[PDB]
Amino acid sequence: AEIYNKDGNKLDLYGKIDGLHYFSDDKSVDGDQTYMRVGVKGETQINDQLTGYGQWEYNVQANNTESSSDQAWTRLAFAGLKFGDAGSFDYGRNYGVVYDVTSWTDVLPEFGGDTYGSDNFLQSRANGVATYRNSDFFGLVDGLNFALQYQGKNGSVSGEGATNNGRGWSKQNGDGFGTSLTYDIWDGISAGFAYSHSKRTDEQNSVPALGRGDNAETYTGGLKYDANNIYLASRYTQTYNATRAGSLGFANKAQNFEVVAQYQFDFGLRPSVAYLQSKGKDLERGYGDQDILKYVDVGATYYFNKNMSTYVDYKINLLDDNSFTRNAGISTDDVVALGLVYQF
Amino acid sequence: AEIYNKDGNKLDLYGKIDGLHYFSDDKSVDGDQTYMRVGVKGETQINDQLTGYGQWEYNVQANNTESSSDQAWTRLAFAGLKFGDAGSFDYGRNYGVVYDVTSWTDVLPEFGGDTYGSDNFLQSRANGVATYRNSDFFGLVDGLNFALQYQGKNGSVSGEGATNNGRGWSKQNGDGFGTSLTYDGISAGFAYSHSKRTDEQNSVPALGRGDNAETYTGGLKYDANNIYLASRYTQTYNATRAGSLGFANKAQNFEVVAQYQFDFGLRPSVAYLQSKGKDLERGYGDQDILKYVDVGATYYFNKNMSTYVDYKINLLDDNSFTRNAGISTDDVVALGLVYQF
Amino acid sequence: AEIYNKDGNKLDLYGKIDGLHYFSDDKSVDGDQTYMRVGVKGETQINDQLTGYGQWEYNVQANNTESSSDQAWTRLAFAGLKFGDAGSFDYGRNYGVVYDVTSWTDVLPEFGGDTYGSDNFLQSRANGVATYRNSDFFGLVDGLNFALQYQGKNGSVSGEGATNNGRGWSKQNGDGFGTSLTYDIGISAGFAYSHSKRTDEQNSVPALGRGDNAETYTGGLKYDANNIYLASRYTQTYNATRAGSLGFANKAQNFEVVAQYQFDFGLRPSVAYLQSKGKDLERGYGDQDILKYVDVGATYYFNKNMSTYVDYKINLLDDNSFTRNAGISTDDVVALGLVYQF
């Protein structure tokens, strides 16, 4: 909600409160999943060719007790400058540019968006990203959106590989960069490409048993159709030393594919059907080729209005239980989600 | 404070900042107790019959350092729909319906509200509650309200009894149900709850054994002519904590409070509270779990600022039960200055 | 931002989002340092001579992951009354009155303000402070301000020295009090004093620092006019200045000086020198430098809501047994920040 707009400065206090329950035979996901999000988004006019901005987004779990630990975290926190019509720069915790394309399939009622994770190189939300964007390809092509992003090393907790803000191997990165390019081809049809290259860290190449290599790389292509009450999107990503092999490390190579179809009825119901897979290749310890993710998703959202909705989502999990999924901690069970959400 | 009201949607950013200090011989409660609360309450008009709403309430302690852990937590987080005469429905972290009645005695300047706890079946705030409420009995009887409530299992951290949101035995529950009924300046109230207990509750702590946690509550309130009087009695089975040692197989909990509101802003308060545990294992037998007289006063400067003193006159004796279970037997004085928004 | 003002009550929701990176050979400070702050400040008119107020300020780190621990904390939380000319009183988590004067040199683009820390007696933000303030000496002497402050013990986690809100020896305190006095002659002078009981764990746990009381004495001078900022202050402490992780300095001498200029087009360069000199340290340490650097940097103000900055800590400490064992950083640091304020 816009709660301040005065003398060239604007502030939005926004969020949602999501009354959410999961039903699954997997006891690590079954049960109450209630949470909320709260954030601020602000803008300050500097001059005719310059606007300042900042955004913070917080996640607050509400499915555990008042004595539980580690229930809140920051999703986004960045500050930036917009340079007229010709671009922007921001720095902080923000989305990696790969998500410029992979966001197109991250539209399921509840599930989806899970062939990658957060703090996973530049695939999703990430610490310390400096992001340059231009929406007219340097004045040459209207509608052609370019991004270039740099990320500094976020290393180990201690020792030779450390930085101030250290973390475990699954969420480490070396210095890296990303780029994306997206374009509306026809009315309502868009195409996009993204690439990332990051140095890996010494702990990534020594602590977990899976995944070895100097660099983490991703290649993504996507398509979207959004018109006439119909939403279709597909994307394909090939990764190298970048996709998590559950708790066991990284996949030397992975091939990640998502497709989604939705329809918006004018009375407020939006059914959704999707297919997702992540195919790991050349895994160590005799694993070879393994499925990391494989499910059909069917669900629907009912929008009461712009501030209130309810939804059901059903993850039909096609993974077989085997020594890889067991050892890596990957859920092979179906899940049903039921939600009622207030947004502000 | 209402900070947004536009095109059918309203948002309140509300809270308080409570500069609070306790004086006690009990070193685990003595000292600075400053904290604040902040929350949002939102409502959206969907159509003539239907409004959607959400509420989040956060508690933020401010009595420890900037390197201290576990200083903030969510009290409430729920989303709901209100229908008209048909009632309301909400889901999330919210009050158990037993508090619809026991709240009538939870009005002391600082203390009170402590014969039960949070995440304690449906006695107070709870995870994963679905709550239906009906006002005026479908519009047929003015002042008659009722509620129906369901809670899904919140299990252990790992193993066979787990759920995603696992916790220790003290705050676990199986599937449960609660109901309340209140009727009106004089009011009477009843509440009942029934929850399945978990395998950890029946094996980890030494105290309390049974398949089910049950509560029965009756209460009365007089609120008129600047006088507030309230009393309630609750009988529980396998549901009242015996401090850190488990649950009381049975307990009998009683509270009574009297207050007067002077025009100039002073509100003195006198109360008596007790919790009596029966049939405790390990030789404990019958034990007092809580017993005190409370005297205090709140001074309201206005609707946004108050100050208060409260004096817990603790009538428990020190014994091996109070020591082992971590129950305070010392007197406490609280002094507070509070800003509300 | 003031987001509510109605029927005698007002509320400000304020903060900043600071996109911040450090470059250093010290791996414990090097890298992303992005964070934000958010708070509320409210006031309510009670009557002609009485206003109530409250403030909360929260710090939220954003430089680590979504599964990281302990990433947020309360800086300030207090409630108070202002009685016109008779003064104000507030209680909660608030600044110690020593900061009334030492804040004069806490103006660097990024660094500075580090000859003391938080929860460090009455040197900075502190739990359980009751603070009386009087502005312009009961309305009788423009520019003459004073404060009186009391702080109850904040003790150990358990045992005989416990309080409900226990913490480690570095952040403990006994009962104490403090006072400040400032006088505006754009030119000001200031004095502050504090005296606290030390706690048993401050004497029994760490290697360094022994004594029943912690005391500080501060004097400051400030020139702030004609686009020029010049400030200096000197503090002598007893059993009160941390000697890194090793304990406290039996005596310390802390000195800071800063000069800045505000150009009309927005740039504010800054040059400063800071040192903390510890004396009579145990275990053979004797006299040791606790802090010693020159700071050079600049802030560019786009407007009142947006700025960018660079800061360069030129660290004059050396690797020796003291800095090494105390965990005191000896390396240079460059900070680069972009900050949105609301």
Ligand SMILES: [Mg+2]
């Ligand atoms: Mg490889």
Ligand SMILES: [Mg+2]
């Ligand atoms: Mg029993």
Ligand SMILES: [Mg+2]
């Ligand atoms: Mg000494």
